[PDB]
């Protein structure tokens, strides 16, 4: 059925270029393809449209000069290139399908999953996982100094879900991220139940299991 499959997450230094792909399956010269980006904690921002049936494009004037959209008929894939990147460009880059290229104008009805582009002078780097040591008791893991997003945290390999809060990451002034994950448990449970946080940083192929003791 209808799918927009985007290329994987990328890290770029300031001044570099990125090209995001948007591979159509289930339908790409039949429909307008659109590009929308979303910075973490911000709203969506429209970038561009292409008519893949004749190569016509429209670009946001702010971010015209730096942006190019193209489409390859043969591989059924559309591309957005953004040049002269700064940390202002760190965003989830969505492609989307709007109306048919022969139809009335329409908004974006089908969205890709987005490609996270992180623009930074930091290098890819797995976290340090530190315990947050403990009748309800709070305990946790501090997942510090990793780059880029994201990291996933589970407890007791996903056995423990009730009372868990995994917080949004903060971007430290070092350019590295830090995140906490906490859980509230019965105080009587301590020194009977073992608590291990399971941290996965896919981007650095890092898995840490950290036991939290009283």
């Amino acid at each position: 059925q209808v799918q927009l499959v985007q290329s994987g997450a990328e890290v770029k230094k300031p001044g570099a270029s990125v090209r995001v792909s948007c591979k159509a399956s289930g339908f790409v010269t039949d429909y307008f393809i659109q590009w929308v980006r979303q910075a973490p904690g911000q709203g969506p921002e429209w970038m561009a449209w292409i008519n893949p049936h004749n190569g016509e494009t429209d670009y946001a004037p702010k971010l015209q000069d730096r942006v190019t959209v193209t489409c390859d008929t043969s591989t059924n894939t559309a591309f957005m290139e953004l040049s002269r990147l700064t940390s202002d460009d760190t965003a989830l880059y969505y492609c989307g399908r709007s109306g048919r290229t022969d139809a009335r104008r329409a908004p974006v009805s089908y969205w890709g999953q987005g490609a996270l582009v992180t623009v930074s002078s930091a290098s890819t780097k797995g976290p340090s996982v530190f315990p947050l040591a403990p009748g309800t008791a709070a305990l946790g893991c501090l997942v510090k100094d990793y780059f880029p997003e994201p990291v996933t945290v589970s407890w007791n390999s996903g056995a423990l879900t009730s009372g868990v809060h995994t917080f949004p990451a903060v971007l430290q002034s070092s350019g590295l991220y830090s995140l906490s994950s906490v859980v509230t448990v019965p105080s009587s449970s301590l020194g009977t139940q073992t608590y291990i946080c399971n941290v996965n940083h896919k981007p650095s192929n890092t898995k840490v299991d950290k036991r939290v003791e009283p």
Binding site: G43, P44, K62, V108, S109, S128, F130, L132, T136, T166
Partner: protein
């Protein structure tokens, strides 16, 4: 650029209530090419309304777009718990095809004070020469809260970061984590580490403390 101004920024309502969301354009949106999107969690936007008043395919009839010119409204006639989300308007006729800044619709519940917990740095972290001290504010409402770090009763400033969870789907509360980061050198200079929490559910700000040792 057509600028879209949505209001309010935040709407706190009971499930079952009517919600009215406004989108004002800085100029006429020709053809009424005004769309409404819903966004939840970490998902792409979902189209609700096109041409200002037309429900997209498989969108329930409790959603209603109206207006024309510079003045548009999304009404949700009866809020189901899945409708608490961010709503963006967008004009899709004039380049650039601008979005509004979003209205957040959040569940209105009774006031709940945070439960506050403070975590000293681990010995594992101190071995590497930095001290992260963490303050947890657990399961509070409303979202508005203030953390003040103190070190021997001196107010801190510029050396902490915090983040807030999404509204909990079971109890409609928020939680907040604040981290104070110091060098092991600066940490070892002081005894009393405290986070002071201000919240509508607290009669006065509450402080949670430990002594290094």
């Amino acid at each position: 650029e057509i600028v879209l101004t949505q209001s309010p920024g935040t709407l706190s309502l009971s499930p079952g209530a009517r919600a009215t969301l406004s989108c004002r354009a800085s100029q006429t949106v020709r053809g009424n090419y005004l769309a409404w999107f819903q966004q939840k969690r970490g998902q792409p936007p979902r189209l609700l309304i096109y041409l200002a008043s037309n429900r997209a395919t498989g969108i329930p009839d409790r959603f209603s777009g109206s207006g024309s010119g510079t003045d548009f409204t999304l009404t949700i006639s009866r809020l189901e718990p899945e409708d608490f989300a961010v709503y963006y308007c967008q004009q899709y006729v004039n380049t650039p095809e601008t979005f509004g800044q979003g209205t957040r619709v959040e569940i209105k519940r009774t006031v709940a004070a945070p439960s506050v917990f403070i975590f000293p740095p681990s010995d594992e972290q101190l071995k590497s020469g930095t001290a992260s001290v963490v303050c947890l504010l657990n399961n509070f409402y409303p979202r508005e809260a203030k953390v003040q770090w103190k070190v021997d009763n001196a107010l801190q400033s510029g050396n902490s970061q915090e983040s807030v969870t999404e509204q909990d789907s079971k109890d409609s509360t928020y939680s907040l984590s604040s981290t104070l980061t110091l060098s092991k050198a600066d940490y070892e200079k002081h005894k009393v580490y405290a986070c002071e929490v201000t919240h509508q559910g607290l009669s006065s700000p509450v402080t949670k403390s430990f002594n290094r040792g």
